[PDB]
């Protein structure tokens with residue numbers, strides 16, 4: 001009943017240096033799902049299902 | 062009943078330096094889902110399902 | 123009953139330097155969904171489903 | 184007698200991403216020379232003495 | 245007599261990502277020479293003495 | 306007499322990622338020479354004395 005947050009950090013990314021020399025990149029998706037190339041990403045959920053880089057499947061019923 | 066937030070951080074990205082030399086990039090999607098190239102992204106949800114870079118599937122019923 | 127926020131940050135992006143030298147970029151979508159090239163994006167939801175870069179599927183019923 | 188330059192590069196800087204978060208910077212020079220903070224600099228000399236960031240001395244005769 | 249340069253590179257810097265989080269920087273020079281903080285610098289000399297970041301001395305005669 | 310350079314590289318720096326978290330930096334020079342903090346530097350000399358980060362001495366005569 002006296003919660004005290006201070007200087008806290010949650011789902012935090014900082015201080016990222018990145019060099020990506022690539023002569024070629026290619027995704028050839030044929031009918032499917034694909035996720036590629038996530039970098040320096042931060043989420044924070046409450047009462048929820050939190051996905052960052054999901055390759056979810058073809059739901060059939 | 063005396064919640065105190067201070068200097069808190071949640072779903073936070075900061076201080077990102079990025080160099081991307083690429084002679085070619087290509088996504089050849091044929092009928093499918095694709096997500097590519099997410100960088101320095103921040104979310105924060107409450108009472109919700111939070112996805113960042115999802116490749117969700119073809120819902121069929 | 124005495125909530126106190128101060129200097130808080132939520133879904134925040136700051137201090138991003140980005141160089142992207144690319145001789146060619148190409149998305150050849152044929153009938154599908156595609157999301158590409160998200161950079162320095164910030165969201166904040168309450169009582170809602172928050173997606174950032176979703177490749178959602180062809181809902182059929 | 185048939186010199187051929189092509190796509191050459193000399194004294195060249197390119198593709199530099201830089202983030203500099205600093206809460207304080209200070210140079211307190213008292214009577215002296217100082218050089219600070221050179222970034223992404225390019226020179227090219229011919230028949231000459233080329234200095235980039237020199238702290239040269241008090242010439243006395 | 246048939247010199248052929250092609251795609252050559254000389255004194256070249258490229259593709260540098262740098263993050264510098266510093267709570268304090270300070271140079272307290274008292275009567276002397278100082279050089280600090282050179283980053284991503286490129287020179288090219290011909291028939292000359294080339295210095296990049298010299299701390300040269302007090303010439304006396 | 307048929308010199309052929311091609312795709313050569315000389316005094317070349319490339320593809321450098323650097324993160325420098327420092328709570329304090331300080332140079333307290335009292336009457337002397339100092340060189341500090343050289344990063345990603347490239348030189349190329351011909352018929353000359355080439356110094357990069359010299360701490361040269363007090364020439365007296």
Ligand SMILES: CNc1ccc(-c2nc3ccc(O)cc3s2)cc1
Pocket residue numbers: 046047064125
């Ligand atoms: C399950 N994760 C979760 C996170 C956070 C919470 C709550 N945060 C607050 C803030 C103020 C207030 O008057 C009521 C509430 S309830 C509840 C659940």
Ligand SMILES: CNc1ccc(-c2nc3ccc(O)cc3s2)cc1
Pocket residue numbers: 186247351352
């Ligand atoms: C000692 N380092 C050195 C480097 C280079 C050279 C020369 N480069 C060229 C280019 C063209 C030309 O007609 C004459 C010359 S001489 C000489 C000496």
